[PDB]
Every structure is written in C-alpha cells, then in structure tokens.
Design a protein around this ligand. Structure first.
Ligand SMILES: CCCCCCCCCCCCCCCCCC(=O)OC[C@H](COP(=O)([O-])OCC(O)COP(=O)([O-])OC[C@@H](COC(=O)CCCCCCCCCCCCCCCCC)OC(=O)CCCCCCCCCCCCCCCCC)OC(=O)CCCCCCCCCCCCCCCCC
Ligand SMILES: CCCCCCCCCCCCCCCCCC(=O)OC[C@H](COP(=O)(O)OCCN)OC(=O)CCCCCCCCCCCCCCCCC
Ligand SMILES: CCCCCCCCCCCCCCCCCC(=O)OC[C@H](COP(=O)(O)OCCN)OC(=O)CCCCCCCCCCCCCCCCC
Ligand SMILES: CCCCCCCCCCCC(=O)OC[C@H](COP(=O)(O)OCC[N+](C)(C)C)OC(=O)CCCCCCCCCCC
Ligand SMILES: CCCCCCCCCCCC(=O)OC[C@H](COP(=O)(O)OCC[N+](C)(C)C)OC(=O)CCCCCCCCCCC
Lengths: 124, 90, 243, 55, 83, 174, 654
C-alpha cells in the first residue's frame, strides 16, 4: 500500500486478505524462519504484487532516500561535464605546427585520382 | 554431368502453358545466381589484393574496392514476380 | 508440444504459401502495419513474461515472442529474411517442445503443481536436470551455434533492410528474450533445495532420450544452417517482388 | 593426506560407447565417401539418389 | 569440511568428491583419447592452413586491378572521390 | 512362428483367481506369501506371445490372454515398486527401446546423411561451374594456358566482362 | 604439428573431457589434466610468438561453410595476427597460471571437477573470441564467454547473492550484445560481408554518417563488457565468485574482450572522428569514477575490481587519441599486474581462519606473511607506474599522449587522466598499509595460525611477479618502439600524434606524474601512521560524501530503482492492466457479459402473461405495423432508418 502501484489494486481484490507489503530483505535474518533462504514462515500470507517484495526481487538499497540519491548522481554527472567544458576555455596553445607530408599531401597514397584529390590527402 | 537447360524469357511465352512459364521462372532465377557469382568472385579477389598489398591497398586496388561497392546494390536476389507480374512500356 | 512446435509454424507456412505470391502488390502498401504489429508483440508480450506466477505460461509467451520475430522476416520482401524465418520455424519447433517437456513434462509428473514459487534448488538433487534447464534455456535465448540465433539474426537483418528504424528498435529482442528466460533459469537452478519438495527421481531414460534428440537437432542447425539450403533456395526467390 | 577414495567406476559406460561409436562411424563414413574422388568420380551415396529428370 | 552426501544421485561431472578407486587406470584411457584426438585433428587440418602474405603473385593483382579498370571504364563510373 | 500353450494359459488364470489384488499383495511393509508372487511376476517376463499365433486364433483365446497379461503386469510392477523381485541389476530393458534405438534413431541418422550429401548439389556449386563454362565458351584461348594459370585467367574475365545475360531476358524494357 | 589447431583444439579437449569423463576420472586426475593441456597450449603460443617476430605473416585456416545466401558468406576462419598473438600470450599465460593456482586454493572445494571444466571452458571461448577472422566468430566467443560468466561466478548455486550476481552480470553483457547484433546487421548490409579483409579494404569509402551508426552500436557493445560508466555494476557485483575466477574475468579476459572489439575495428575507427570523441570522454569519466569509488570502499576484492575499471578507462583514452599501440601494450602488461593482484588478495584471504575480506579487519601481517607481501608490492609498484617496473612503460605514456595530441581540447584529459594516477596511489597505499603495516585488528588466533600456502599458490605468484617486472621492458620495442611495423593498424596520418608526444613533452609534464605519484604514495603512509585523525574525522558533511563514494557513486541505487524496479512495475502494468485486463474486455470476458445481458433481454421479451395466446397475438400486430411504418420512413430518406434500427436493437437486446 506504500507504493503507488499497490494502491492501484484495491478495487480488484474481493476476498483477498490485503496484507501490508514489506520487503523480504529488510526483515532481520536472525529470526529462525522456516525458509532461511527467503525469510518466510510456512503459512504466511503473500502480498498483492509479491514478486517485487521477494528475496529474488531487486536489491532495494536502504541508506539514501531514492530522491536524494537521484540528486547526488545527477550532481556528479553535472560537476564532471561542466568543469571539463569550462576548462576547455582555459587551455594553453601548442608549441608545434602539425607536421607535414610530401607528394602534394600523400593524396595518391591513401587512394585518390587527380580529379578526386580533395577527399584524400593531408598537409601538402 | 553439368547440365545446361535453355533460357526462356517471360516476353511472348503465352502465360496459359505452365511449361514455358515455369522454365522462364527457373531461368531468370538461375541467371540471377550466375549474376551473383561475379560479386562473390570479385570479393574473393579483393580480399587477396588486400592481404598481399598490406599498407598500399588504398592505391593498389581502389578499382576493385570501388568495383565491389558498385556491384553490391545491383547483384543480389530480386524476384521473378517483379518482372512477371509487371510489364514495362505499357 | 504438438501445439507449440507444429500448429504455430503452420501460419508461418501459410503466410508464405497463401499470402505473398498472389497478394504481391497489396503487401508493399501494407507491410508497415505488419511491422507495427510484430514489433509490439516483441516489445509487449516479451515484457509481460516477467510477471508470471505459473511455469508453463512463461514458455507460452516465449513462443509468442519468437513467432513475432519470425513474421518480420517473412514480410521483409528480402532474401535473407525468408530463409531466416524458415530456420526459426524449424529450430523453435525443436527447442520449444523440449521446454514443455521440462515444465509440464518432467516437473508436473513429479510434483503436479505448476506454480513457480515452490521451485528452487533443483541442482542439489537433480544435477542432470539442471544441465537441461540451462543448455536448453541458453538455446532459447539465442546464443549462437544453436540454430535459434541463425534465425533470429537473419530475420532481424531482413527486417532491418525493409525498414531500418523498425529493425533497430526490434533488435532489443535479444535482451528481452534473455531477461525472463534467465530469470526463470536462475530461480529454478539455484538456492537451497526447497522446503515443500521431497526428493524425487532423477530424469529417466526416456526423458533423456527425447531431450538429447531435441538438443542435437538444434545444434546441427546451429553449426551448419546449410544442411537445408538444398531445399530452400528456390523458395528464397519465389516470394520477392522488388522488380 | 589421503584424498579419501570413492568406489571404483568403469570407463566405457554406455553413453561413452554410444556417442563415440556414432560419432566415429559418421566420421569414417564421411572419409569413406570422400575417398571416391578418383575411384569413381562421385560419392557413394549419390548412387542411391534417383529423382526424376526435370523434363 | 567433508560433510555427508547422498550417494544415490548420479551426476555426470562427478558429484561432490569424485575420487574413484581406478582413476590411475582410467587416466590412461583419457590420455590415450586426448593424444589421439589432438594428433588426429592437428594432422587433419594441415592442408586447410595457408600462409597469409605471398599466396598469390603481384602480376595477378595488377591485372585484376586492370580488369577492374576495364569493367569500371565500360559502365562510365566516376571515382568516389570525383564530385 | 512362435508358440504358446493353451492349458497353461487356463491354469494361470486358475492360479490368479486365488491371489489377492495388486493393491494388497505387496502392502505388507517374507517367503510365506511373497515367494509365490516372485515367480508369478516372472511369468510376465517369460515371453509367451507367438508371432503367427496372434493371427491364426480366435478372440476366445485373445480375451483370456489379455486379462492374464493385464494381471501379471500389475503383479510385476507393484512388486518392483515396493521391493524376479528381490534382486537389483541394471538396466532392465523397457518397452519402447526396441523401436526407438533400432528404427527411430537409424532412420534419424540416415536423414542427416542424406541431408549432408544432398547439399552437394547446390545452386552455388552449380553456378560457379556454369559461370566458368560461360567464360570458357566465349574465350576458349585461356584453355591453352597451363592448369595452374587458368584459375587466375578466368577471374580476369569475370572481373572484366559482365557475362550475366539478365538484361537479355528483359527485352520489353528497352 | 599445426600450431593453430593445437592452440584451438587443445583447450577444447580441456573442457570436453572433464565433463564427459568427470565421474570416471575424478578430481585428482582432473586437477593435473586440465592444467597441463593449458600449459602446453601456452608454450606453443610463446613459440608461435617467437616465430611471428621473425616474419610478419600469419597463418589462417579455413573450415566448413557456416552459411551463404546472396551477397553474404560466413566461414570458420581463424587467423593469428599480431593483434591476436598479443592477447593470445596474455590470456594463455594468465589462464595457465590460474589453473595451477586453483589447485591449492580449491583443495577443500567439493565440486572442482566442474570448476576446472569451467575454467578451461572460459579459456576456450576466449581462445576463439580472439583469433576468429570475421565478425561472426567474434560474436560466437563474445556470447559464450557471457554464458560462462553466468556459470562461473554462480559456482555456489546454494548462495543467493551469487545467483543474483550472475543475473546482474549476464543481463548487463546482454544489453551490449543487443547493440552488437544491431551493429552486425548494419555491417552485413553496408559492406555485405562479415570478414575483416573486405571491410578493412573498403572502409575508407563509406561516409561518416554510416560509420557513426556502426561504431555507436559496436561501442555500446564494448561499453557494456569493458565496463565503462553507462553500466559498470557487474564487475563489483561479480565478487561472489571465488578468487581464481576473478583472476581471469577481471585480470585480463572478460574486461579485455570489449577492448579487443575496438582494437579489431581500428581500420574503420579512423574515418570517424565523431565516435572517437565520445570514446575519449567516456573513458576519461571512468578513470575518475572508479578511482573515487576505490578510495572509499573498504573491501579487498572491490578495491582491485575498481582498479580494473579505472584502468580500462586509460585504455579507452588511448583508443580515442588514435594511439592503438599504447592501448594494446597497456592491455598486455595490465593482465600481469592484475592477475598477480587478485591471486595475492586470494592468498591473504585464504590465510585467515575466518576467511574475511574487510580491510578494516586484517591488521599487521608483515612479519607473518612476507611472501605475499613481496608479491603484492611488485604488484602495487607496477600498478602505480614506478620507474623501473613495467608500469612506467605501460601507463605513464598514455598520460603523456594527452598533451601531445593535435586536438587542443585534449589538454583537459591530461589532468583528467592525471588525477586518476594520484588517486591510483592513494588506494594502493590503503591496501598496503591497512593489511600489512597497521596495528592488528582481528582476534589473535588468526595471528597464531597465519601462514602461507603450499606450492600451488606460491609458484604462480612467483612467475607472474617475474612477468610483471620484466615483460614491459622486454616487449617495449615491439609495441612501442619507434618505426615498428608489427601491428597492421592503419592510422590516418592526419591523426597520428605519437612522434609529437615523444619529443614535445617538456621536463615538467613528464616529471610531474612520476614525482607526485611517489610523493603522494609516501604521504598516505605517513598520514596513516603518525597522525591518523585526518582520515578519522567525524564530520557530518565529509561522511555523507564518504557514503556516496562507498556505495558505488550512488548509481547502483540509481540503476536499480529508476530502471529495473520501474521496468518491473511497468511490466506489471501490461500483464495485468493490458494482457489480462483490457485485451480480455475485447476478448472472452467482455463478450461473455455482453452476450449474458443481450441473451437475458431476448429471453425476457415475453416473460409474464401466462395467457400466451394474447401475448403472441399482440406481438403479430406490431410486427406488421413496425415494418409497415419502417418502409414508409425508408423510401423518403435512407439515413433516418439507421438510428431507428439501432434503437430497435437497443430496446430488443437491452
Ligand atoms: C558427426 C557428429 C554428429 C553426431 C551426433 C551424435 C549422435 C550420437 C547420438 C547417439 O549415439 O545416441 C544418443 C542419443 C541420446 O542419448 P541416449 O543414450 O539415448 O540417452 C539415454 C540415457 O540418457 C543414457 O544414459 P545416461 O542417462 O546415464 O546419460 C546421462 C547423460 C547426462 O545427463 C546430462 O546432463 C546431459 C548433458 C546435456 C547433453 C546435451 C548433448 C550435447 C552434446 C554435445 C557434445 C559435443 C560434441 C562435440 C565435442 C567433440 C569432443 C571432441 O549423458 C548424456 O546423455 C550426454 C552425452 C554426452 C557424452 C559424450 C561422450 C562422448 C563424446 C563424443 C563426441 C564426439 C563428437 C565428434 C568428435 C570426434 C569427431 C571429430 O539417442 C539417440 O539415438 C539420438 C538420435 C541420434 C541422431 C541425433 C540427431 C541427428 C539428426 C538430427 C536431425 C536432423 C537435423 C534436423 C532436420 C530437421 C529438418 C530440416
Ligand atoms: C545513452 C547510452 C546508452 C548506454 C547505456 C545507458 C545506461 C543503461 C543502463 C540500463 C541498461 C542495463 C541493462 C538492463 C538490464 C538490467 C538487468 C539487471 O540489472 O538485473 C539485475 C537484477 C538483480 O541484480 P541485483 O539484485 O542488483 O544484484 C545484487 C547483488 N548483490 O535482476 C533482476 O531481477 C532484474 C529483472 C528485470 C530486468 C530489467 C527489466 C527492465 C529492463 C529495461 C529495458 C528497457 C526496454 C524498454 C524497451 C522500449 C523500446 C521502445
Ligand atoms: C556448445 C557445446 C555443446 C553444448 C554443451 C555440451 C555439454 C555436454 C555435457 C554437459 C555436462 C554438464 C554436467 O554434467 O554438469 C553437472 C552439474 C553437476 O554439479 P555437481 O558438482 O556434480 O553437484 C550438484 C549437486 N548435486 O550440474 C550443475 O550444477 C549445473 C551446471 C551446468 C554446467 C553445464 C556446462 C555446459 C553449459 C554450456 C552452455 C551451452 C549453451 C548452448
Ligand atoms: C570441435 C572443435 C572443432 C573441431 C574442428 C575439426 C576439423 C576437422 C577437419 C574438418 C574438415 C572439413 O570440415 O572440410 C569441410 C567440408 C567440405 O568443405 P570443403 O569445400 O571441401 O573445404 C573448405 C575449405 N575451403 C573453403 C577453402 C574450400 O565440409 C564439412 O565437413 C561440413 C560437414 C558438416 C556436417 C553437419 C554438422 C555436424 C555437427 C554436429 C555436432 C554435434
Ligand atoms: C574526495 C575524498 C573526500 C572524502 C575522503 C574520505 O574521508 O574517505 C576516507 C579515506 C581514508 O581512509 P578510510 O579508512 O576509508 O576512512 C574511513 C573513516 N571515515 C568514514 C571517517 C572517512 O580518505 C582517503 O583515503 C582519501 C584522501 C586522499 C585523497 C587524495 C586525492
């Protein structure tokens, strides 16, 4: 009932007991269940939309809030590509010219025809 | 024994006899595989040009590379139903 | 088995035999409805597989997703897609009834209930069934050298010729067919052997004799898909209308 | 230091015999037919191929 | 560890700790089959190997470039670089 | 033309009529009652059928046989489940393995053999030779070349000439 | 003696025979069978490398046709290029050391017939990933190493987290496998061929707008498996497998295959400056991301896994700067770093009674374990590019080539790749201090029973130590060198900047990495030992930052909650709101209710009035009046009877 999809299934159930969905992972492990593997007593009512709250369900972290976590991830993505873009204005220039090649730019060596000399050839 | 059956066009074969129609279908088909083996032969020659040339493949067989990229849209299977169901200049 | 291996490939045969050679001009107007319907069976029905409590229903929707790949190889009006859909029809008809022997064949004979939630830890008491879980699943996903990938590859390529944006979107099916099949495979294969489950027999001589036939007959097509090009090379041409 | 030996097991179990026998039989059959390039000029099982002429 | 295991289940890769009593005998069969396989495959694939460079002559490649130029000349095909 | 016996086949039913049902005859978790059954269970295996004996008889013998085999079957397999009975050797041949290893599997191997050698006659293997013959028909002077030279002198014709004759089937086009 | 079929078929023997004859031979025989066949594979490939130094022509072999249709053939062609033999002597050497290392590390593992089958299998589909001579066999090995990466790290099927980590790993790789299939479908239509020899002959003619479409797909394929930032959370989620598995899957091989895709395609890579820019600025991001996470995570396997993904960023930077010799040389010497780092970490995990992995619970192990000390300090001084070792030859020159490139914006990636080297020192000092030099941290039994392992764990660390010291100076004239025509990569000469980056470097920019790497490596040890309050502050603000970089730069949470969990929720909005909800309303559920209502109304047409004669007799009148007015309404206008007939159906059926 916590999530917006669990709320959206209230009018379907008619005889279903409608229990509180709680993750199988955030139960403690030290209580001795029937199923130590999945943290579940033998006859325990499964939830509306169980397989998101299974042990085989996703990992479901519990340290940050997911909204905060979204802010911190996009914050690192912003602080990298903003700083690396601003730092292209503070770049120093090169001390050397680009090097050069003979034979009118090696136009003939990388393919080429006399009419076709524009597409092939570098730095005459 | 490598047999060579005859070529029959679709033009003027009277599509009411199933003998000449089916031979026209198979002939246009088999000539189309022949038309493809030229592509498969120039590809085999272009790779040997490349492997022997090494670094100067850019200028040794520019003609074979451009040759292969010229044949490639126009040497493939295309269907006898395109030319049988339609007539040009009508 | 006879439904999913034979009744489904019949309409793959009937779209070739009935439709394509007298509907030649009515299709090229109307193939981009076939691409709509085939894509949103691949996108939709291979995504509803994820949330399935029953174990035979998953392999059912797997059959839907591969038959939705296959009919965008037929309706390509190109030469690789026709042969790719035929090799899909001959290889899915091998790999899929083997999976129905795994789900309702062996496991329903032993425990008579087909809910997924009872079934974990199949390795510790049935090792030489968990092998047939894995190699037959990894044959269904479209790992190469199995004859499903030759068909998936050529049909996605033929559907990439005809319209490349629909082929680029439809290429995601390799992912979407891996997701549910490997999720099922690692739920069944791994974990502690279940509470609910007394240990029953190993997979018996007949339920190996079936399986190895349905596995070699995929692997031969996967190592050589050319063993049936001697039949099909006319029907690769008999259905193209690209003038 | 003893690796704690398990009961004795024969080598040529039935699947070894069946799978290796059929695989080596098919390989020997393939080489048997490829040995007829100069002896007859065509393969042996092609002599069993009798379709009708296309005409 | 050496926890106990059920001896009735028959795997193919061995089980938990497979150490059968005649493994010295079966090792001889395994090495015989492995050396037979390795030598037979290594001699069978000898004529299928070729050497990459130098398998065809230069004169062949120059005349294939010539025939390419003939076929290209007859269809009236500009160079890809020609605009 | 195998054999049977009639009077044995009647006396077997006379023996079975005094026996308990298959759902009782083995559910006693020895040799006072379990020793007669361990021979009767081998009467299932002993293979009295008749190749030509099924053809040349009437249904009065047939129904009697079929009821006797249908009871010997249960006395074999129920005693196999709970407990010749008291042995263990492998592997007791089944019912399907005669016509799946000796008719299904060799026809299914023969299908592979025919598919491999029918792939020799292919359109690529025929089209390559037809293209080489079309080269050697128009230009038969490259037959005068040595045998090693001809494989490079055909390819210069293939690369050189068109030699496809597809535009000659399309005479309505131009 | 073919020296290719002995390279290929011999680990195929090493896989197939442990499974077929596993129960018959047993684990004691499979330990020495599986190892020695990889040993002789390895000493055939050194000999072939020695011959290939003599002349530069490879041998290929040709096998049976896979499939040909129109414009397309696919064969089984295996060709051992220079680019192939580099990776080949990497993976055979690393693998053959791991097969020996896992004899003594697994001596109490039950199921080590399957485990040696699986190690030699992963060796084999690497062996055919590398040497195939089309993009198809490069797909074959690419998928079967993904299949093994399922079957390997989920070795303990009993453990839950290993099975979910296998799910994570293989589905991450499969994301890139989809884009590799997309790219390969573009390959076989632009070029018509999957062979390398045609594609590389004709790649200079196809324009940039298509090669962007190709190499975007073939870079997402490598970004998935060579673990760049877009998805990277399967490496660190692959440590539920054991340590000799990690000494393959992260030392060289599985990380290396994504680099190999971009090393093969280097002849189509040149003609796209569009993809090389994004290759640069993804590989530049991942050095920083992995260096910043590898500081703050205190688990021994996670340190070296994030080291691997901080250095594949350096290889990717070397790709994007059009310097492929640097990336291939780093790929080679990097295996001999990492495999020694992993099988040193496995030796100090295995040498504790608890077998723990937190670095916070090791303490002083210097006097107790000197052998693994001297091995892992070979490893760390190689890893930080110290002057004598292979790391100086293999890692600092990639930092050099950022300054020497012709694009002006690549001076930024100098400091972007430099920061990563300072950060590379600050965790290697963390792992050398907090498990060897510090005050003890465990209970004292683990200090009574601390010892070393027999010969199977000592000898591969010895050999990989020798290689990780010498092989960079020995092989620095084949990959680096100066005019070395050994690899056949064809750099565009308008993009070739290696002659520029050797000489235009001033003393400061070359001196500065070596120096500050050393100096920060002393500062971390001194600030750990003397002061130690700097690192143990209880700032509320610094520790939110530490908890960010501990939890993988939160992104595992991001990928899990915003994509996986939302993907499962919106797949439940199809299987229940569409597949079972609304397509049955137009199917067998809505039509059952429609026919139930309409049948009930036509049944109840004549319900009451048990005088059935009067009931049927007043009905015959209407049905010659309603028709008689209906036709009058019709032949004045047709349209005005259709709502009449719809309303008659409404009053009749409802
Ligand atoms: C030429 C190559 C091709 C030949 C193929 C092999 C044929 C051999 C089959 C055989 O002999 O009978 C066994 C087979 C089943 O085995 P079974 O003994 O009956 O099972 C009963 C009990 O299970 C048996 O008792 P069990 O239960 O105790 O056994 C336990 C089970 C364990 O339980 C398991 O978990 C099984 C594990 C999964 C099994 C999956 C099978 C995959 C096999 C891969 C093998 C790779 C081979 C390549 C590697 C080569 C090695 C160098 O073990 C297995 O069954 C696995 C067997 C693996 C053992 C292999 C040992 C010998 C290896 C020899 C390989 C040599 C190949 C060539 C190399 C030499 C030449 C260069 O029965 C059959 O008769 C099958 C039919 C034979 C023909 C097969 C199909 C051919 C045609 C296909 C159809 C045509 C194409 C489609 C056309 C469609 C229309 C277009
Ligand atoms: C722009 C550049 C693009 C480059 C990439 C950019 C970033 C993309 C990142 C997302 C892609 C990653 C691949 C998607 C598959 C994810 C699979 C997965 O992560 O499964 C893991 C999960 C269990 O893993 P876990 O519990 O975390 O393990 C903890 C171990 N201690 O196992 C599970 O149980 C999960 C089962 C569900 C799997 C996910 C289902 C949704 C998949 C989304 C695909 C979207 C397809 C939409 C198609 C629309 C097309 C129009
Ligand atoms: C392509 C090449 C041909 C296809 C593969 C051919 C393989 C043929 C023989 C397979 C034999 C595999 C096997 O027997 O593994 C058994 C293994 C038993 O595990 P065990 O240590 O004995 O303990 C179990 C606890 N009761 O059972 C298990 O634990 C499950 C692990 C299965 C490992 C199978 C390895 C092959 C997988 C290849 C994938 C191919 C996909 C196509
Ligand atoms: C197991 C690890 C790999 C082992 C590799 C061993 C190589 C042995 C030598 C092979 C010689 C060869 O294949 O020859 C190839 C022959 C004929 O082709 P060709 O034109 O004459 O030569 C080709 C060289 N060209 C191109 C230069 C001309 O075709 C075949 O055989 C195909 C037979 C396939 C049978 C169906 C597949 C069955 C697989 C079932 C498995 C369960
Ligand atoms: C950016 C870093 C900001 C927070 C760092 C931190 O405080 O992380 C801790 C580690 C210290 O080692 P520790 O044992 O993990 O401290 C754990 C104790 N806490 C939880 C209080 C932190 O700092 C470093 O090594 C990075 C310092 C050198 C970086 C040079 C570049």
């Amino acid at each position: 009932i916590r999530a917006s999809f669990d709320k959206a299934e209230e009018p379907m159930l008619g005889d279903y007991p409608d229990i509180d969905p709680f993750p199988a992972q955030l139960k403690n492990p030290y209580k001795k269940y029937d199923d130590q593997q999945d943290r579940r007593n033998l006859e325990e009512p499964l939830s509306v939309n169980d397989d998101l709250y299974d042990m085989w369900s996703p990992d479901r972290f519990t340290h940050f809030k997911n909204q905060d976590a979204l802010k911190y991830f996009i914050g690192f993505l912003t602080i990298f590509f903003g700083a690396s873009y601003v730092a292209t204005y503070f770049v120093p220039e090169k001390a050397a010219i680009p090097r050069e090649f003979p034979y009118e730019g090696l136009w003939k060596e990388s393919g080429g025809t006399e009419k076709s000399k524009a597409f092939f050839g570098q730095r005459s | 024994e490598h047999q060579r059956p005859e070529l029959v066009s679709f033009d003027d074969i009277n599509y009411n006899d199933h003998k000449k129609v089916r031979e026209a279908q198979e002939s246009y088909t088999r000539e189309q595989f022949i038309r493809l083996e030229a592509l498969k032969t120039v590809r085999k020659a272009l790779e040997k040009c490349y492997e022997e040339s090494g670094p100067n493949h850019f200028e040794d067989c520019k003609n074979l590379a451009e040759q292969y990229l010229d044949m490639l849209p126009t040497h493939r299977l295309q269907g006898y139903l395109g030319y049988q169901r339609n007539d040009p200049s009508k | 088995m006879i439904l999913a291996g034979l009744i489904l490939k019949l309409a793959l045969y009937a779209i070739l035999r009935l439709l394509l050679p007298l509907l030649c001009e009515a299709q090229i107007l109307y193939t981009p409805m076939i691409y709509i319907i085939s894509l949103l069976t691949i996108i939709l029905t291979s995504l509803a597989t994820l949330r399935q409590i029953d174990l035979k229903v998953i392999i059912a929707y797997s059959s839907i997703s591969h038959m939705g790949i296959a009919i965008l190889g037929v309706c390509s009006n190109t030469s690789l897609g026709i042969y790719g859909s035929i090799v899909l029809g001959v290889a899915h008809g091998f790999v899929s009834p083997a999976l129905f022997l795994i789900v309702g064949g062996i496991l329903y004979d032993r425990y008579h209930i087909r809910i997924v939630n009872y079934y974990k830890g199949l390795t510790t008491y049935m090792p030489q069934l968990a092998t047939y879980i894995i190699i037959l699943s990894f044959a269904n996903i479209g790992t190469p050298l199995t004859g499903n990938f030759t068909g998936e590859f050529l049909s996605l390529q033929g559907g990439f010729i005809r319209n490349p944006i629909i082929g680029g979107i439809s290429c995601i099916s390799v992912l979407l067919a891996a997701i549910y099949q490997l999720k099922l495979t690692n739920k069944l294969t791994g974990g502690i052997s279940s509470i609910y489950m007394h240990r029953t027999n190993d997979v018996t001589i007949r339920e190996k004799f079936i399986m190895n036939i349905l596995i070699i007959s995929t692997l031969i097509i996967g190592i050589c898909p050319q063993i049936m090009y001697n039949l099909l090379y006319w029907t690769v041409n008999n259905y193209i209308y690209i003038i | 230091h003893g690796p704690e030996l398990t009961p004795a097991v024969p080598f040529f179990q039935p699947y070894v015999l069946k799978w290796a026998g059929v695989s080596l039989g098919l390989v020997a059959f393939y080489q048997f037919n490829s040995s007829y390039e100069a002896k007859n000029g065509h393969t042996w099982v092609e002599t069993f191929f009798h379709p009708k002429s296309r005409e | 560890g050496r926890y106990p295991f059920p001896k009735d289940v028959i795997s193919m890769t061995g089980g938990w700790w497979a150490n059968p009593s005649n493994w010295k005998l079966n090792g001889l069969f395994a090495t015989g089959i492995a050396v037979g396989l390795a030598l037979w495959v290594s001699t069978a694939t000898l004529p299928y190997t070729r050497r990459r460079e130098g398998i065809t002559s230069e004169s062949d490649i120059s005349k294939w470039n010539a025939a390419a130029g003939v076929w290209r000349e007859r269809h009236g095909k500009i160079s890809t670089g020609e605009a | 033309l195998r054999a049977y016996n009639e009077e044995k086949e009647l006396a077997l039913k006379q023996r079975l009529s005094q026996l308990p049902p298959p759902g009782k005859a083995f559910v006693t978790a020895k040799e006072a009652e379990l020793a007669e059954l361990a021979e009767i269970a081998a009467l299932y295996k002993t293979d009295r059928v008749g190749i030509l004996d099924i053809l040349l008889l009437g249904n009065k013998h047939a129904r009697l046989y079929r009821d006797n085999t249908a009871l010997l079957k249960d006395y074999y397999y129920n005693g196999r489940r709970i407990l010749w009975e008291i042995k263990r050797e492998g592997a007791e041949k089944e019912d399907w393995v005669n016509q799946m290893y000796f008719l299904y599997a060799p026809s299914l191997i023969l299908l592979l053999i025919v598919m491999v050698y029918k792939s020799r006659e292919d359109i690529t293997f025929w089209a390559k030779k037809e293209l080489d013959q079309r080269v050697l028909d128009k230009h038969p002077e490259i037959n005068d070349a040595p045998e090693n030279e001809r494989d490079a002198l055909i390819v210069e014709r293939i690369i050189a000439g068109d030699y496809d004759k597809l535009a000659s089937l399309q005479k309505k086009a131009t | 003696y073919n020296a290719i079929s002995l390279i290929i078929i011999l680990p195929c023997i090493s896989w197939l025979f442990p499974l077929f004859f596993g129960r018959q031979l047993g684990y004691v025989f499979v330990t020495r069978m599986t190892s020695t066949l990889i040993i002789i594979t390895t000493l055939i490939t050194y000999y072939y490398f020695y011959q290939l130094l003599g002349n530069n022509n490879p041998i290929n072999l040709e096998l049976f046709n896979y499939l040909n249709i129109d414009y397309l053939d696919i064969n089984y062609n295996f060709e051992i290029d220079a680019l192939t033999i580099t990776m080949l002597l990497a993976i055979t050497t690393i693998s053959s050391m791991v097969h020996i290392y896992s004899i003594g590390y697994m001596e109490t593992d039950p199921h080590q017939v399957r485990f040696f089958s699986l190690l030699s299998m992963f060796t084999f589909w690497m062996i055919i990933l590398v040497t195939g001579s089309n993009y198809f066999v490069l797909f074959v090995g690419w998928e079967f190493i993904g299949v093994t990466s399922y079957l390997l790290i989920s070795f303990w099927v009993t453990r839950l987290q290993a099975m979910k980590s296998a799910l994570s790993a293989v589905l991450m790789n499969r994301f890139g496998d989809a884009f590799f299939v997309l790219g390969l479908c573009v390959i076989a239509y632009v070029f018509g061929t999957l062979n390398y020899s045609t594609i590389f002959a004709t790649a200079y003619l196809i324009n940039t707008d298509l090669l962007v479409l190709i190499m975007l797909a073939l870079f997402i394929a490598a970004m998935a498996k060579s673990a760049q930032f877009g998805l990277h959370n399967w490496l660190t989620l692959a440590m539920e497998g054991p340590t000799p598995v990690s000494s393959l899957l992260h030392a060289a091989t599985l990380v290396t295959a994504g680099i190999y895709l971009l090393l093969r395609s280097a002849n189509i890579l040149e003609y796209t400056p569009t993809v090389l820019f994004i290759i640069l600025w993804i590989g530049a991001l991942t050095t920083l991301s992995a260096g910043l996470i590898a500081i703050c995570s205190n688990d021994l396997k996670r340190i070296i896994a994030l080291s691997t993904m901080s250095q594949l960023g350096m290889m990717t930077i070397a790709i994007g700067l059009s310097a492929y010799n640097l990336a291939l040389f780093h790929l080679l010497g990097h295996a001999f770093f990492k495999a020694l780092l992993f099988m040193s970490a496995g030796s100090i995990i295995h040498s504790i009674l608890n077998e723990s992995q937190d670095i916070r619970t090791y303490g002083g192990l210097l006097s107790y374990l000197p052998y693994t000390y001297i091995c892992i300090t070979i490893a760390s001084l190689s890893l930080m590019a110290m002057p004598g070792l292979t790391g100086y030859y293999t890692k600092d020159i990639i930092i050099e080539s950022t300054y020497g490139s012709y694009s002006i914006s690549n001076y930024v990636v100098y400091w972007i790749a430099y920061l990563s080297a300072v950060l590379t020192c600050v965790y290697s000092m963390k792992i050398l201090y907090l498990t060897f030099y510090s005050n003890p941290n465990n209970n004292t039994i683990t200090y009574y029973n601390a010892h070393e392992s027999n010969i199977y764990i000592t000898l591969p660390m010895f050999i990989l130590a020798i290689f990780a010291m010498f092989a960079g100076w020995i092989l620095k004239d084949i990959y680096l060198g100066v005019g070395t025509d050994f690899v056949g990569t064809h750099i565009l000469p308008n993009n070739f900047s290696y002659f520029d980056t050797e000489f235009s470097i001033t003393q400061f920019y070359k001196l500065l990495p070596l120096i500050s790497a050393i100096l920060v490596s002393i500062l971390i040890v001194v600030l750990n030992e003397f002061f130690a309050i700097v690192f143990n502050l209880n700032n509320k603000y610094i520790n939110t930052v530490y908890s960010i970089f501990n939890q993988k730069l939160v992104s595992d949470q991001i990928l899990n909650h915003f994509i996986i969990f939302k993907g499962l929720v919106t797949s439940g909005n199809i299987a229940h709101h569409v597949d079972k909800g609304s397509l049955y309303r137009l199917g067998p559920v809505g039509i059952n209710r429609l026919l139930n209502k309409a049948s009930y109304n036509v049944i109840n047409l004549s319900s009451n009035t048990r005088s059935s004669l009067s009931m049927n007799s007043m009905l015959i009148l209407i049905t010659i009046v309603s028709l008689l007015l209906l036709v009058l309404v019709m032949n004045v206008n047709f349209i005005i009877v259709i709502p009449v007939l719809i309303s008659i159906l409404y009053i009749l059926f409802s």
